[PDB]
């Protein structure tokens, strides 16, 4: 029975659902037995940039509440020199853990999910945020709706329970020596996964070879034929290596796959 107070409200810890570094995530209950997620960061051991990255994510999360329900809700928060508590809506499971259950995916639900994702990413792009880290774990399933969790700004924690370079756009790699199109590529890999059960480059074990294959236009991404030909078209337009050629999000919003 470990509790937490945030802005004068007590929450009881059900379990820890993720942790890393100076930070933790818990499922909690208020006194009315309503469930929430609480994200905790210990600033006492936090570094400086962790601090500013964490102030930026919180402000953006707050600003964007009004604009989309495909962004996770921040109900309240507390910041001190010592700690951060963030009280957020609690979801059922993240999209990465659910895809690992290896079950059939309803093509109708795959497209409903794809829609939610596009809506959430489109919303952050409208405010000038390009996520750059998009992965299934950035998405939370709440009442059959996908909701975006983070903005890619603050660093990450790692999931806990009681029981990857794969999404990297070729631009990012050549950049070793940023476009909203970067998110399209990553989103593309995610839809690719909900379609073919694997990521485009997943097969390559050696990470050097894999980073090369992503940037090598002579490396052909497979697109097996499937009942939905328009989905197949979405995959191909998301997965073009040339960001200028790659489809944008507002176009993806108008595509037959989500509109029909
Ligand atoms: C692990 C850190 C990670 N997640 C969060 O920050 C975060 C924030 C708000 C949230 N509301 N609900 C969740 C959530 C609830 C359930 C859930 O799945 C459960 C628990 C774990 N297992 C293995 C399956 C069943 C997953 C999430 C929630 C999570 C994080 C994610 C993206 C970007 C940054 C960070 Cl720190």
UniProtKB/Swiss-Prot annotation:
ATP binds at residues 17-25, 39. It comes from the Eukaryota. The active site is at residue 133. Disulfide bonds: none annotated. Residues 11-258 form the Protein kinase domain. Present in rapidly proliferating cell lines. Involved in mitotic spindle assembly checkpoint signaling, a process that delays anaphase until chromosomes are bioriented on the spindle, and in the repair of incorrect mitotic kinetochore-spindle microtubule attachments. Phosphorylates MAD1L1 to promote the mitotic spindle assembly checkpoint. Phosphorylates CDCA8/Borealin leading to enhanced AURKB activity at the kinetochore. Phosphorylates SKA3 at 'Ser-34' leading to dissociation of the SKA complex from microtubules and destabilization of microtubule-kinetochore attachments. Phosphorylates KNL1, KNTC1 and autophosphorylates. Belongs to the protein kinase superfamily. Ser/Thr protein kinase family. Interacts with TPR; the interactions occurs in a microtubule-independent manner. Interacts with MAD1L1 and MAD2L1. This is Dual specificity protein kinase TTK. It comes from Homo sapiens. The lineage of its organism: Eukaryota, Metazoa, Chordata, Craniata, Vertebrata. The gene is TTK. The chain holds residues 515 to 793 of 857 of the full protein.
